[PDB]
Amino acid sequence: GEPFLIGVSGGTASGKSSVCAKIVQLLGQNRQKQVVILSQDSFYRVLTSEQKAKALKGQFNFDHPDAFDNELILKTLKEITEGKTVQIPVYDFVSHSRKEETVTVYPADVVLFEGILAFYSQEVRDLFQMKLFVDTDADTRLSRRVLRDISERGRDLEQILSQYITFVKPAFEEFCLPTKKYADVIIPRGADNLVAINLIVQHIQDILNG
Amino acid sequence: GEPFLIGVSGGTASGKSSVCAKIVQLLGQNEVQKQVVILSQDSFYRVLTSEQKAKALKGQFNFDHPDAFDNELILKTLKEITEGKTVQIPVYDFVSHSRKEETVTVYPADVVLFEGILAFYSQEVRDLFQMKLFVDTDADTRLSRRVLRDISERGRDLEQILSQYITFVKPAFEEFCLPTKKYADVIIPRGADNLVAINLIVQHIQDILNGGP
Amino acid sequence: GEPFLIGVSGGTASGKSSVCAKIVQLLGQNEVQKQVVILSQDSFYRVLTSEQKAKALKGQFNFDHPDAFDNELILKTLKEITEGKTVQIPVYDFVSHSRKEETVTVYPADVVLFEGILAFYSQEVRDLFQMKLFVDTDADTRLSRRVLRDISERGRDLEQILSQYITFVKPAFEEFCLPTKKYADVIIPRGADNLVAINLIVQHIQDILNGGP
Amino acid sequence: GEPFLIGVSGGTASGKSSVCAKIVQLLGQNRQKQVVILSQDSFYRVLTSEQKAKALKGQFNFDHPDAFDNELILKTLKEITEGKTVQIPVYDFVSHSRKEETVTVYPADVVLFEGILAFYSQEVRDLFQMKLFVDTDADTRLSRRVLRDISERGRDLEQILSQYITFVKPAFEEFCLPTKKYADVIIPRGADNLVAINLIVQHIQDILNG
Ligand SMILES: [N-]=[N+]=N[C@@H]1[C@H](O)[C@@H](COP(=O)(O)O)O[C@H]1n1ccc(N)nc1=O
Ligand SMILES: [N-]=[N+]=N[C@@H]1[C@H](O)[C@@H](COP(=O)(O)O)O[C@H]1n1ccc(N)nc1=O
Ligand SMILES: [N-]=[N+]=N[C@@H]1[C@H](O)[C@@H](COP(=O)(O)O)O[C@H]1n1ccc(N)nc1=O
Ligand SMILES: [N-]=[N+]=N[C@@H]1[C@H](O)[C@@H](COP(=O)(O)O)O[C@H]1n1ccc(N)nc1=O
Ligand SMILES: [Mg+2]
Ligand SMILES: [Mg+2]
Ligand SMILES: [Mg+2]
Ligand SMILES: [Mg+2]
């Protein structure tokens, strides 16, 4: 069959992955539908030595649409829509290097693609049969983002905040937030909005059933 | 010869003090001078009982709640300043959460600026202000500034800072500060960076002090 | 000899048109005159396809969404007005949800006011404005004004009005209009009733037109 | 035993009664705790013929603290806290008349007292062992209030709105909203905030159990 591709966007630490996890979990509550969640973060571009030098100095914008391998995203997603098995790269964010190992993703009935810029490119955007944007208060997101980067990346607090003000927040307002208008459903308060998520799940189930 | 009281509000680390400072500096650049004094709501915290200080040590005291401040003393102080009287302002030790014996003498001035997250909360205090300004700054910009302020305090954990913010500061802002925003004369987006708005406010103050243009 | 463009935003029935009207009237009272024209975003709705009009008849078309407006035509029109050109403005029939054949000629002016709930949404349009104002009015005050406007339309059900508001108008305001509020130079609480704020804005406009005080 | 008195306040159509119903319903989910919900609207004062004339002309403020029989409220609530059976008046809002029939309320383990001005009087406020304030967007509340009054009171639309602007909204900002500072828990989004309500229920259960 043909997979049902769902695109999920939203600002940093807005709860995109939590909303996808909730969707899969509620899909199984109601044979079973196979569901897989993909992340745009897996498709960061391979950096040159100069770009990696700027990144280690905190001078590379990883929130700009150019930072993502949009060509690899488009090709991976188009092969999924045609029902094939694909290989997903494994990107190391602490070292800014795409690892050699890949992850095999077998065909599923529903595929969720989440990322801060999932709706930016028009070609990938037209592949999504449903599009969701996760909305969360900017300070709530920042404090999640700060705790997340302190532990998962081991970075300094002052350097996290200066990176946020320099790159993350401006790129959100210039590149991510405008893609909100392409969303079929906008979800305020993220995964805690179980009412909205339940409507989305019921909509997904009715499209697959008939 | 009546002091001109200006109330300044806005969320934590929105720029209330910087806006007050910019107004003071701009008022002096166009002097042909004016006595200007700045008061802060943070000087009027209540003295905590030993029961309350115990909860405070466990991070279970809401310092952002209206009850945390001496609203009676705020009103009495600002009313006397309005009448041209000289007032005594307490000094508050935040480590001890108590008031030192020494007070600060504050003399009347041409312009008195009072800044506070809850400056507009009480109706009696709000009516004392002949001009009211609200500083509107992005929440994540404010949180970044607020974290850097609090973290400079020695032995103040970051996860303690962020959890106090999520539990007390953000809810108190939404529930007690934001409903008063409607009462301002002018709302200043982006804080002290908004000089077109601040220049208009300063020009309006100069013309009130001069009895006209 | 360049027209001075002012962008005005704020939620539904916040007072955008009244604020524009008050600015026009106050600019003429202190003339020693200035040509001022007012444009509205509601003139730039897109023509609806027969598929879209069908959903509109079932109350399932979002007229508050950014896609409902001709952003290309808005930008092209305001860019030509900025250059001092004369523009043709469409006329929109709301019953038919289509554009009449007749257009309205709009000549350049000293001051051009553009008002719209989504006036600041697009970055290209937002940068054309040399001054940006946001009108901040209580939501229940706005809803009361909005219901009385819509209910005067013949055969327009009240429960249809309120459900269109809850489904489309309020969410679009929170998700598309409010994030642009930060870009305004001045935020006007309580709308056209705020004459201290409006007087400051008018005085600032007069001084830009005069090249100084 | 002694009943556990809970006071619930909030603006018009904020969901106060819906929050009380949800609390009772979740209390029984977890012998059983007997719970009763009382409404401040039952204790409107008996109007004189002149006051009733102004009310029929739309010139009486039913949102002012003086409109409620605070003496009867205090006495009814104090007798409840001492464990007695009380009689609750039955007020007719369309006619502004207290009916002669009363409702018998037998002792319960938990008593919820909801009303726009439940925390206004300090004497009634000190009787509440827990205090809750329900927060909801003003336009959401107005549209609920409008539909509610169109049907339950049969009033004209223009007269509902003018009453709201003249009395309801100003009295909310002057009398109701300031009592928010007495609340132990503030509930944004009303009954839809099942996370906050669950914490309240668990707190109630732990106070009753031990
Ligand atoms: N910096 N920065 N911001 C980006 C994005 O905002 C976030 C995307 O996902 P999200 O968690 O915001 O949803 O990843 C961060 N990233 C990317 C590569 C790397 N080597 N280190 C990182 O930190
Ligand atoms: N926690 N907390 N919040 C409060 C207020 O929100 C902020 C004042 O407002 P502002 O400076 O943000 O304008 O001070 C914090 N405070 C209070 C006492 C203390 N011993 N240490 C503190 O940190
Ligand atoms: N529905 N709705 N919302 C829209 C907008 O929110 C409002 C414009 O903004 P404003 O007048 O509130 O400033 O017009 C309404 N509209 C649009 C088309 C039509 N045929 N009838 C209407 O009523
Ligand atoms: N008018 N008015 N406002 C009041 C209050 O706002 C509301 C209290 O309860 P709430 O539903 O706002 O929670 O009752 C209304 N009332 C009272 C007596 C009467 N004879 N007719 C009424 O309509
Ligand atoms: Mg993620
Ligand atoms: Mg300060
Ligand atoms: Mg208009
Ligand atoms: Mg009720």
PDB file of N, CA, C and O in Angstrom, chain A residues 137-143 146-147 150 157-158 161 164-165 169 173, chain B residues 138-144 147-148 151 158-159 162 165-166 170 174:
ATOM      1  N   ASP A 137       4.536  28.246  24.457  1.00  0.00           N
ATOM      2  CA  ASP A 137       5.066  29.528  24.918  1.00  0.00           C
ATOM      3  C   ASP A 137       6.585  29.560  24.802  1.00  0.00           C
ATOM      4  O   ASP A 137       7.270  28.578  25.099  1.00  0.00           O
ATOM      5  N   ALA A 138       7.106  30.711  24.372  1.00  0.00           N
ATOM      6  CA  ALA A 138       8.523  30.814  24.045  1.00  0.00           C
ATOM      7  C   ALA A 138       9.406  30.559  25.262  1.00  0.00           C
ATOM      8  O   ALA A 138      10.472  29.947  25.141  1.00  0.00           O
ATOM      9  N   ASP A 139       8.980  31.014  26.444  1.00  0.00           N
ATOM     10  CA  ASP A 139       9.798  30.799  27.637  1.00  0.00           C
ATOM     11  C   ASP A 139       9.729  29.350  28.099  1.00  0.00           C
ATOM     12  O   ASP A 139      10.737  28.793  28.553  1.00  0.00           O
ATOM     13  N   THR A 140       8.553  28.722  27.994  1.00  0.00           N
ATOM     14  CA  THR A 140       8.456  27.289  28.256  1.00  0.00           C
ATOM     15  C   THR A 140       9.397  26.505  27.350  1.00  0.00           C
ATOM     16  O   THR A 140      10.078  25.577  27.800  1.00  0.00           O
ATOM     17  N   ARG A 141       9.453  26.870  26.068  1.00  0.00           N
ATOM     18  CA  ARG A 141      10.332  26.165  25.143  1.00  0.00           C
ATOM     19  C   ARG A 141      11.795  26.424  25.472  1.00  0.00           C
ATOM     20  O   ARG A 141      12.623  25.508  25.402  1.00  0.00           O
ATOM     21  N   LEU A 142      12.134  27.663  25.833  1.00  0.00           N
ATOM     22  CA  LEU A 142      13.532  27.983  26.103  1.00  0.00           C
ATOM     23  C   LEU A 142      14.054  27.192  27.292  1.00  0.00           C
ATOM     24  O   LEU A 142      15.175  26.668  27.257  1.00  0.00           O
ATOM     25  N   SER A 143      13.241  27.066  28.343  1.00  0.00           N
ATOM     26  CA  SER A 143      13.717  26.382  29.537  1.00  0.00           C
ATOM     27  C   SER A 143      13.831  24.879  29.299  1.00  0.00           C
ATOM     28  O   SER A 143      14.707  24.217  29.860  1.00  0.00           O
ATOM     29  N   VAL A 146      17.052  24.653  27.265  1.00  0.00           N
ATOM     30  CA  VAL A 146      18.257  24.871  28.059  1.00  0.00           C
ATOM     31  C   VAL A 146      18.628  23.606  28.825  1.00  0.00           C
ATOM     32  O   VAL A 146      19.781  23.163  28.797  1.00  0.00           O
ATOM     33  N   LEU A 147      17.658  23.009  29.526  1.00  0.00           N
ATOM     34  CA  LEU A 147      17.920  21.770  30.254  1.00  0.00           C
ATOM     35  C   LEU A 147      18.303  20.642  29.304  1.00  0.00           C
ATOM     36  O   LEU A 147      19.171  19.821  29.620  1.00  0.00           O
ATOM     37  N   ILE A 150      21.960  21.270  28.203  1.00  0.00           N
ATOM     38  CA  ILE A 150      22.923  21.127  29.292  1.00  0.00           C
ATOM     39  C   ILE A 150      23.337  19.668  29.443  1.00  0.00           C
ATOM     40  O   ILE A 150      24.516  19.356  29.653  1.00  0.00           O
ATOM     41  N   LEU A 157      26.083  27.062  29.965  1.00  0.00           N
ATOM     42  CA  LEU A 157      24.832  27.814  30.034  1.00  0.00           C
ATOM     43  C   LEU A 157      24.919  29.127  29.261  1.00  0.00           C
ATOM     44  O   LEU A 157      24.022  29.456  28.476  1.00  0.00           O
ATOM     45  N   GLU A 158      25.981  29.906  29.487  1.00  0.00           N
ATOM     46  CA  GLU A 158      26.103  31.184  28.789  1.00  0.00           C
ATOM     47  C   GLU A 158      26.185  30.980  27.283  1.00  0.00           C
ATOM     48  O   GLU A 158      25.659  31.787  26.507  1.00  0.00           O
ATOM     49  N   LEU A 161      22.589  30.194  25.830  1.00  0.00           N
ATOM     50  CA  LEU A 161      21.727  31.367  25.703  1.00  0.00           C
ATOM     51  C   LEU A 161      22.167  32.262  24.550  1.00  0.00           C
ATOM     52  O   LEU A 161      21.326  32.726  23.767  1.00  0.00           O
ATOM     53  N   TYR A 164      21.081  30.797  21.389  1.00  0.00           N
ATOM     54  CA  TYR A 164      19.642  30.941  21.194  1.00  0.00           C
ATOM     55  C   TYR A 164      19.305  32.328  20.662  1.00  0.00           C
ATOM     56  O   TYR A 164      18.599  32.469  19.656  1.00  0.00           O
ATOM     57  N   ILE A 165      19.826  33.368  21.315  1.00  0.00           N
ATOM     58  CA  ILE A 165      19.538  34.734  20.899  1.00  0.00           C
ATOM     59  C   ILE A 165      20.116  35.021  19.518  1.00  0.00           C
ATOM     60  O   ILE A 165      19.513  35.753  18.724  1.00  0.00           O
ATOM     61  N   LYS A 169      16.331  31.853  17.958  1.00  0.00           N
ATOM     62  CA  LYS A 169      15.174  32.746  17.943  1.00  0.00           C
ATOM     63  C   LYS A 169      15.020  33.499  16.624  1.00  0.00           C
ATOM     64  O   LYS A 169      13.903  33.508  16.077  1.00  0.00           O
ATOM     65  N   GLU A 173      11.698  32.991  13.908  1.00  0.00           N
ATOM     66  CA  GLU A 173      10.791  34.034  13.444  1.00  0.00           C
ATOM     67  C   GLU A 173      10.873  34.231  11.937  1.00  0.00           C
ATOM     68  O   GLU A 173       9.868  34.573  11.303  1.00  0.00           O
TER      69      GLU A 173
ATOM     70  N   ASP B 138       9.483  39.892  24.593  1.00  0.00           N
ATOM     71  CA  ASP B 138       9.338  38.459  24.337  1.00  0.00           C
ATOM     72  C   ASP B 138       9.673  37.632  25.574  1.00  0.00           C
ATOM     73  O   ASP B 138      10.631  37.921  26.296  1.00  0.00           O
ATOM     74  N   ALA B 139       8.886  36.576  25.798  1.00  0.00           N
ATOM     75  CA  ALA B 139       9.038  35.777  27.012  1.00  0.00           C
ATOM     76  C   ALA B 139      10.389  35.065  27.061  1.00  0.00           C
ATOM     77  O   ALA B 139      11.003  34.969  28.129  1.00  0.00           O
ATOM     78  N   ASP B 140      10.871  34.556  25.924  1.00  0.00           N
ATOM     79  CA  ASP B 140      12.157  33.866  25.931  1.00  0.00           C
ATOM     80  C   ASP B 140      13.319  34.849  26.051  1.00  0.00           C
ATOM     81  O   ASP B 140      14.338  34.527  26.672  1.00  0.00           O
ATOM     82  N   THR B 141      13.185  36.049  25.485  1.00  0.00           N
ATOM     83  CA  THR B 141      14.159  37.100  25.767  1.00  0.00           C
ATOM     84  C   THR B 141      14.191  37.425  27.255  1.00  0.00           C
ATOM     85  O   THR B 141      15.269  37.547  27.851  1.00  0.00           O
ATOM     86  N   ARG B 142      13.018  37.538  27.879  1.00  0.00           N
ATOM     87  CA  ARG B 142      12.964  37.833  29.307  1.00  0.00           C
ATOM     88  C   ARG B 142      13.559  36.699  30.138  1.00  0.00           C
ATOM     89  O   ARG B 142      14.292  36.950  31.100  1.00  0.00           O
ATOM     90  N   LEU B 143      13.257  35.445  29.786  1.00  0.00           N
ATOM     91  CA  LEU B 143      13.755  34.325  30.584  1.00  0.00           C
ATOM     92  C   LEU B 143      15.274  34.228  30.515  1.00  0.00           C
ATOM     93  O   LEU B 143      15.929  33.949  31.526  1.00  0.00           O
ATOM     94  N   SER B 144      15.850  34.470  29.337  1.00  0.00           N
ATOM     95  CA  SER B 144      17.303  34.470  29.203  1.00  0.00           C
ATOM     96  C   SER B 144      17.942  35.531  30.097  1.00  0.00           C
ATOM     97  O   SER B 144      18.886  35.243  30.840  1.00  0.00           O
ATOM     98  N   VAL B 147      17.526  34.398  33.808  1.00  0.00           N
ATOM     99  CA  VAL B 147      18.399  33.314  34.251  1.00  0.00           C
ATOM    100  C   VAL B 147      19.798  33.840  34.552  1.00  0.00           C
ATOM    101  O   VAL B 147      20.411  33.470  35.559  1.00  0.00           O
ATOM    102  N   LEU B 148      20.317  34.725  33.700  1.00  0.00           N
ATOM    103  CA  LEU B 148      21.662  35.253  33.908  1.00  0.00           C
ATOM    104  C   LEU B 148      21.736  36.115  35.163  1.00  0.00           C
ATOM    105  O   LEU B 148      22.759  36.117  35.857  1.00  0.00           O
ATOM    106  N   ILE B 151      21.485  33.429  38.193  1.00  0.00           N
ATOM    107  CA  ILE B 151      22.585  32.475  38.284  1.00  0.00           C
ATOM    108  C   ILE B 151      23.850  33.116  38.841  1.00  0.00           C
ATOM    109  O   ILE B 151      24.725  32.412  39.351  1.00  0.00           O
ATOM    110  N   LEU B 158      20.800  26.142  38.696  1.00  0.00           N
ATOM    111  CA  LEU B 158      20.069  26.499  37.483  1.00  0.00           C
ATOM    112  C   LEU B 158      18.707  25.818  37.436  1.00  0.00           C
ATOM    113  O   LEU B 158      17.690  26.459  37.153  1.00  0.00           O
ATOM    114  N   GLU B 159      18.670  24.511  37.698  1.00  0.00           N
ATOM    115  CA  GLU B 159      17.396  23.802  37.696  1.00  0.00           C
ATOM    116  C   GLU B 159      16.469  24.326  38.784  1.00  0.00           C
ATOM    117  O   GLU B 159      15.243  24.244  38.648  1.00  0.00           O
ATOM    118  N   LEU B 162      15.067  27.574  37.034  1.00  0.00           N
ATOM    119  CA  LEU B 162      14.071  27.302  36.006  1.00  0.00           C
ATOM    120  C   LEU B 162      12.783  26.746  36.597  1.00  0.00           C
ATOM    121  O   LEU B 162      11.696  27.040  36.087  1.00  0.00           O
ATOM    122  N   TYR B 165      10.810  29.487  38.138  1.00  0.00           N
ATOM    123  CA  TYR B 165      10.183  30.273  37.081  1.00  0.00           C
ATOM    124  C   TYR B 165       8.910  29.596  36.581  1.00  0.00           C
ATOM    125  O   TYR B 165       7.850  30.228  36.494  1.00  0.00           O
ATOM    126  N   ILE B 166       8.994  28.302  36.262  1.00  0.00           N
ATOM    127  CA  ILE B 166       7.836  27.585  35.736  1.00  0.00           C
ATOM    128  C   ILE B 166       6.728  27.507  36.781  1.00  0.00           C
ATOM    129  O   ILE B 166       5.539  27.595  36.453  1.00  0.00           O
ATOM    130  N   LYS B 170       6.235  32.606  35.977  1.00  0.00           N
ATOM    131  CA  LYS B 170       5.385  32.642  34.790  1.00  0.00           C
ATOM    132  C   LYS B 170       3.899  32.637  35.139  1.00  0.00           C
ATOM    133  O   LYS B 170       3.166  33.493  34.616  1.00  0.00           O
ATOM    134  N   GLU B 174       1.147  35.779  34.284  1.00  0.00           N
ATOM    135  CA  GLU B 174      -0.047  35.648  33.462  1.00  0.00           C
ATOM    136  C   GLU B 174      -1.306  35.985  34.248  1.00  0.00           C
ATOM    137  O   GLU B 174      -2.246  36.564  33.695  1.00  0.00           O
TER     138      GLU B 174
END
